[PDB]
């Protein structure tokens, strides 16, 4: 029996649709590890049942055909439950890494879900270590290239940009940008991409 496992897989598909329709890493859902641990306890029951069945089979009272068929059925049950659980976990890890890579490896606790408490603790430490790996990777031979930058090809050199949030004045190369609330800048494209990604600017 593995029908419970199906309820997981179908649910995962909905999550994929959330990834597809939005085309943006945002509001990842809250885990379903309760059903997972229910499956774990029932498969532990299955495993102990297999161990006892092997015990009677070695005893000699049990019939060989019954033992072998029950062994195959139980092995298939474990295989399918493991398949469902790994199908869930692989998609979870994929979406985790996809949202982790694009925000410069900082996880942006200053602004995406706020407390990221809908993730499991194991998933949270995985996210932290992946951020560590991303920070480490661009510290090698690619120090002169920002990998986590934009991927839209550079089409124009001078653009108009409109401020979205108020701040003080920010130092730049040979200049200073005072972010007065609700103002428009006519500046270089290669100077405000970091601010635009952070959400402090608008109207590219």
């Amino acid at each position: 029996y593995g029908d419970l496992g199906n309820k997981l897989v179908l649910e995962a598909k909905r999550t994929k649709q959330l990834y597809a329709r939005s085309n943006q890493d945002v509001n990842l859902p809250m885990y379903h590890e309760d059903i997972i641990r229910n499956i774990l306890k029932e498969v532990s029951n299955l495993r102990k049942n297999t161990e006892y069945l092997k015990e009677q089979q070695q005893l000699g009272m049990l019939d060989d055909k019954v033992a072998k068929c029950q062994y195959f059925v139980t092995l298939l049950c474990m295989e399918r439950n493991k398949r469902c659980l790994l199908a869930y976990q692989r998609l979870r890890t994929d979406i985790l890494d996809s949202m982790a890579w694009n925000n410069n490896g900082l996880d942006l606790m200053s602004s995406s879900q706020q407390d990221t408490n809908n993730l499991s603790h194991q998933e949270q430490e995985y996210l932290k270590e992946y951020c560590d790996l991303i920070t480490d990777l661009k510290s090698g031979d690619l120090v002169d290239i920002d990998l986590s930058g934009s991927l839209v090809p550079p089409s124009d050199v001078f653009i108009d940009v409109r401020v979205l949030k108020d701040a003080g004045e920010i130092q730049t190369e040979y200049g200073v940008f005072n972010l007065i609330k609700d103002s428009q800048f006519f500046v270089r494209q290669s100077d405000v991409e970091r601010l635009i990604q952070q959400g402090y600017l608008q109207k590219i």
């Binding site: 597809a20 996809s98 090809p153 089409s155």
Partner: protein, 190 residues
């Protein structure tokens, strides 16, 4: 680049970039001949054309540099030969008289057209609306021919001699997947 399924095909902006990384002709409005002054000394394009440049003469530069000079008053782009009414007329006649072969056109088709119509508006010797309408008619008939030819989807191969970049890009995810499914069905049946 992952972004979901954006790792399999090219986005239109990438197509625009790869097209604009191509040579083009230019008539400069200024002079930068060396005194017989800062060196251009670029890495991915010959400087000797840019540095040894004199006004009102023909020279070849990359498209993005031409656009950058066109933003100021330092440029005058020369339109290609195929962007005129007398060439598009014979082209459309060729498509009309030949109902199976795609006419020969540069693979930058519709893309150089879009860029030139957007930016280089005041340098054309012909009205813009007429050229735009004729290009639309060309696109229309080529679309009809592509739709007619798409009916044959063999599991072995296919031939498309003279399709432009955008036409191939917008059709790849459908044709590729359908042919892959047919191949899988055939292979699983043997």
């Amino acid at each position: 680049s992952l972004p979901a399924h954006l790792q399999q095909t090219f986005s239109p902006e990438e197509i625009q970039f790869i097209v604009e990384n191509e040579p083009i002709k230019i008539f400069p409005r200024i002079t930068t001949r060396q005194k017989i002054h800062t060196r251009w000394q670029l890495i991915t394009t010959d400087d000797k054309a840019l540095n040894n440049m004199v006004a009102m003469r023909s020279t070849e530069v990359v498209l993005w540099i031409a656009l950058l000079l066109k933003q100021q008053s330092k440029c005058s782009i020369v339109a290609p030969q195929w962007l005129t009414t007398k060439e598009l007329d014979r082209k459309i006649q060729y498509e009309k008289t030949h109902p199976d072969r795609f006419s020969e056109l540069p693979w930058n088709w519709l893309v150089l057209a879009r860029i030139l119509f957007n930016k280089a508006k005041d340098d054309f010797h012909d009205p813009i609306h007429e050229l735009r309408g004729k290009i639309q008619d060309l696109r229309e008939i080529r679309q009809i021919k592509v739709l007619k030819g798409l009916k044959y989807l063999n599991e072995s191969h296919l031939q498309l001699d003279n399709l432009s970049l955008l036409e191939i890009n917008e059709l790849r995810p459908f044709i590729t997947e359908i042919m892959d499914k047919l191949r899988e069905i055939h292979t699983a049946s043997l």
